[PDB]
Paper text:
The microscopic openings across the walls of many capillaries contain a protein mesh that is formed by the extracellular domain (ECD) of [name] ([name]). Current evidence suggests that a single transmembrane protein, [name] ([name] or [name]), constitutes the diaphragm’s sole structural protein. [name] is a type II transmembrane protein of ~60 kDa with an ~390-amino acid C-terminal extracellular domain (ECD), a single transmembrane domain, and a 26-amino acid N-terminal cytoplasmic domain. The three-dimensional structure of [name] [name] presented here shows that it forms a parallel disulfide-bonded dimeric coiled coil.
[name] [name] is 89 amino acids in length and contains five cysteines. [name] [name] contains five cysteines and one methionine, and previous studies have demonstrated that SAD from sulfur-containing residues—sulfur SAD—can be used for experimental phasing and structure determination. For this experiment, we first screened additional crystallization conditions and obtained [name] [name] crystals in the P212121 space group with unit-cell parameters 35.6 Å, 86.2 Å, and 181.6 Å, referred to hereafter as crystal form I. We then collected data at a wavelength of 1.77 Å, using a low-noise and fast readout EIGER X detector, with an exposure time of 0.015 s per 0.2° oscillation. The data collection encompassed a total rotation of 1,800° while continuously advancing the crystal 300 μm. Constraints related to the detector-to-crystal distance and the long wavelength of the X-ray beam limited the resolution of the sulfur SAD data to 2.4 Å. The structure of [name] [name], determined from crystal form I by sulfur SAD, reveals a parallel dimer with five symmetric interchain disulfide bonds (SS-1 by Cys142, SS-2 by Cys153, SS-3 by Cys178, SS-4 by Cys199, and SS-5 by Cys224). The five disulfide bonds were confirmed in the anomalous difference map. The electron density for residues 141 to 145 of crystal form II chain B was not visible. Structure-based analysis by the Socket2 algorithm for both crystal forms shows that most of the [name] [name] dimer exhibits a classical coiled-coil configuration characterized by heptad repeats (abcdefg in Fig. 6A). Among [name] [name] dimers, the average rmsds are 1.15 Å for crystal form I chain A + B vs. chain C + D, 0.89 Å for crystal form I chain A + B vs. crystal form II chain A + B, and 0.84 Å for crystal form I chain C + D vs. crystal form II chain A + B. Conformational differences are greatest at the N terminus.
Residue numbers in the entry:
A (entry chain A): 0 to 88
B (entry chain B): 1 to 88
The structure:
Amino acid sequence: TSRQCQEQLKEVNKTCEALLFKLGEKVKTLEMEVAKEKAVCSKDKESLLAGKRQTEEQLEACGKARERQQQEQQVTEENLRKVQSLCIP
Amino acid sequence: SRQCQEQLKEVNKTCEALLFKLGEKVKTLEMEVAKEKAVCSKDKESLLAGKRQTEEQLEACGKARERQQQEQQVTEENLRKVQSLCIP
């Protein structure tokens, strides 16, 4: 075993070994990111759906109010025509 | 530098083979992150657009029930005015 063979054996895996540690850190970082994105997505979707449900309920109520205001108008209009036709016999 | 080079070769080959196996894990996870972010943002955009259209419908319905009330006031005012000219 030469002294230059020994120096080479000491150095051969250094960058490979240092990369192994860095890849462990990257795996952990990516596993946390997957878990976080999945949790934030579902939370955001729930808020959007809740906001949308509230607007749909308001649209339903407005629509029903619109049907009963067009109902009353038809009655008032006929009463007005009746009074105008029978006015001054 | 005789059997030393064959030693340097086998030790690095073992280390490099482990690095590439672990590297398959990183690549798999990067693709999963990219896929989920694309599906999530696309779905969020559709939900927000759908919400924006229902609000516009609620705004239009509200403006239509404002026109109906104003026209009901017009009919009631005409009825009140014509009643003063006609016997009940």
